[PDB]
């Protein structure tokens, strides 16, 4: 589980994504494993906007941040996991590390802030949604 909490916005896994959330939606893709909804305080995460290879995710499944280097968001094919089957999901960036379910709303952040949230694994490799290119989770 996690969030990144941008302004009055609320970035979620659309796989994890509450009642709440879906009743407070500002917007989904289900290519991209993400849901945004609204909050009534602000959140204190910062997004990255860059084109960083380089960064360091949050991993519950050890209780770790992990530095790591990854892939450029893409169109990869996912195996199935708990809560997906074997698909494609786009805007994904993949590293090597440990990734479980539950890690999904890990965040991989940079030397700019957040780049985005674990949400796909498999054989060693932990997959990110990306956020960088979500522009207008800055501005209204
Ligand atoms: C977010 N990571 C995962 O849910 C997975 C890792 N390995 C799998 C077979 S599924
Ligand atoms: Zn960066």
Redesign the pocket.
């Known amino acids: 589980s996690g969030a990144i909490y941008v302004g009055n916005y609320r970035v979620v896994n659309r796989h994890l994504a509450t009642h709440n959330d879906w009743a407070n939606l500002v917007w989904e893709d289900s290519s991209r494993d993400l849901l945004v909804s609204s909050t009534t305080a602000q959140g204190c995460d910062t997004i990255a906007r860059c084109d960083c290879q380089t960064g360091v995710y949050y991993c519950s499944s050890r209780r770790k941040h992990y530095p790591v280097s990854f892939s450029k968001p893409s169109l990869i094919f996912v195996?199935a996991?708990?809560?997906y089957p074997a698909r494609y999901q786009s805007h994904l960036m993949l590293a090597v590390g440990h990734?479980?379910?539950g890690?999904?709303g890990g965040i991989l952040r940079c030397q700019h802030g957040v780049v985005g949230i674990?949400?796909?694994?498999?054989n060693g490799l932990?997959?990110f949604a990306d956020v960088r290119d979500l522009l207008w989770l800055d501005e209204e």
Request: proline share 6%; glycine share 18%.
């Open positions: 195996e996991s708990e809560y990734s479980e379910p890690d999904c674990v949400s796909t694994g498999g932990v997959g």
